[PDB]
């Protein structure tokens, strides 16, 4: 079963949770079209040129637009960008570990 790539905007539901094992859990809400769809996600450097982080959640998907999705990721130490969704209105979250 193939799913479309989410084209629309995402919103952070609550404050990003930090786990004791050096990971972060981001709870997002989809505002766009095409659900069920894959959540575009990437942890990058501040220059947005290299992939630095690791996604822990296997294939983040919006099952229903009305239900938020928990995304677990492992950011690198120091400064990084959490990039959620495609442009326009792409979430670009600053993160410091």
């Amino acid at each position, epitope marked *: 079963m*193939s*799913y*479309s790539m989410c084209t629309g905007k995402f919103k952070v539901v609550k404050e990003i949770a930090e786990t004791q094992h050096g990971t972060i859990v981001i709870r997002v809400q989809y505002e766009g*079209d*095409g659900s069920p769809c*894959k959540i575009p996600f990437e942890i990058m450097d501040l220059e947005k040129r290299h992939v630095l982080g690791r996604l822990i959640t296997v294939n983040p998907i919006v099952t229903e*637009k*009305d239900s938020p999705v928990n995304i677990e990721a492992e950011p690198p130490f120091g400064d990084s960008y959490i990039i959620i969704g495609v442009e326009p209105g792409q979430l670009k979250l600053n993160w410091f570990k």
Partner: antibody
Amino acid sequence: EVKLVESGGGLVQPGGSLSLSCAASGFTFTDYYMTWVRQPPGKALEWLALIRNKASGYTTEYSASVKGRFTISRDNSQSILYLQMNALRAEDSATYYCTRAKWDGHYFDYWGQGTTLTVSS
Amino acid sequence: DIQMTQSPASLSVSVGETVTITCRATKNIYNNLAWYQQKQGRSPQLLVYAATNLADGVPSRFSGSGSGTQFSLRINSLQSEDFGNYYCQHFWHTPWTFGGGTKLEIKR
């Protein structure tokens, strides 16, 4: 079960107005995005307008070809989709289809039989 | 905006042969792509959605492939009922543009 029946097609003078309707049945109307697609004789299909479901606040989108002239609307009590067409021109002559989208606007899974519009003097 | 180009414009293929038709997007659309069939004097019908999923009631002889900018529709051991027009459509940002179409005709 799922059925879409368009009506309202006919002959209109250039600059005139016409309203098309699409009677929907066999599904929960408010749960689905609805669309209008047209096809001029011997030409390709053209997406014109969309109307979102209840969850998305029934918002609309239009192609640049019809923006400002056409209005998509829905009667959620009667499960009817409408297309209000103003300032009609010869290039609006086509078969008009009303469609249901499968995944929140994506993939036109059900189409009506179509209704024909002719814009001419 | 993203434009959709289909190839070939027309083709004649015999019953029982396998056919592949292609669709190209001007920009990356991942797998947000649909294929439709339209027979003489009838409404278009959904064949493939999300580039590879078969729509309800579509025979398994149909198969969609591709991700990004290049897509293919394959018909294995094609039948007389498969002849007609084929359109691709993207589902990225609006407008959701259709390709110009490919006319599949019967070789006899």
